[PDB]
């Protein structure tokens, strides 16, 4: 456990492309990788009355937001990590690098 890369997004397709291409860069250099880990997906929920005034049958709306997280572990030297993760990210994906 030298470098931990954590990616989170609200778009499932976007977060998979970032993970897959990051693995591509690591393999093209031949740096050892602990396979990507799919952390539990979270749902944020809000329930509100539909009416703006409070008349009629009491009906409700349910709104949901899904958050996807992926974890990739790399064991590589210092300057090698910046080279590997220097590429640009798609919109809506947050990437964080942590040294445990």
């Amino acid at each position: 456990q030298r470098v931990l890369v954590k990616m989170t997004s609200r778009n499932a397709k976007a977060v998979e492309r970032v993970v897959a291409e990051l693995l591509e860069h690591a393999r093209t250099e031949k740096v050892e990788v602990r396979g990507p880990v799919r952390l539990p997906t979270r749902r944020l929920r809000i329930t509100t009355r539909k009416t703006p005034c409070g008349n009629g049958t009491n009906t409700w709306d349910t709104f949901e937001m899904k958050i996807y997280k992926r974890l990739v572990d790399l064991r590589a030297s210092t300057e090698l990590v910046k080279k590997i993760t220097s590429f640009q990210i798609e919109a809506g994906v947050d990437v964080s690098i942590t040294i445990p």
């Binding site: 509100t48 349910t62 709104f63």
Partner: protein, 56 residues
């Protein structure tokens, strides 16, 4: 000393009277979950842009 008295209670900053909707400044039926601070009527109109989707 009338300026010391002008908005003395509003300066304390506690209770329902210290919170405003960040869109319309109304003080009724706020949604405080996840620190949203949007009233329930304004949330329904802006829920799509914020990122909430009706699925179930």
């Amino acid at each position: 000393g009338h300026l010391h008295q002008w908005r003395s209670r509003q300066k304390i900053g506690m209770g329902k009277g210290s919170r405003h909707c960040v869109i319309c400044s109304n003080q009724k039926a706020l949604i405080r979950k996840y620190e949203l601070n949007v009233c329930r009527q304004c949330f329904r109109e802006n829920a799509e842009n914020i990122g909430f989707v009706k699925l179930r």
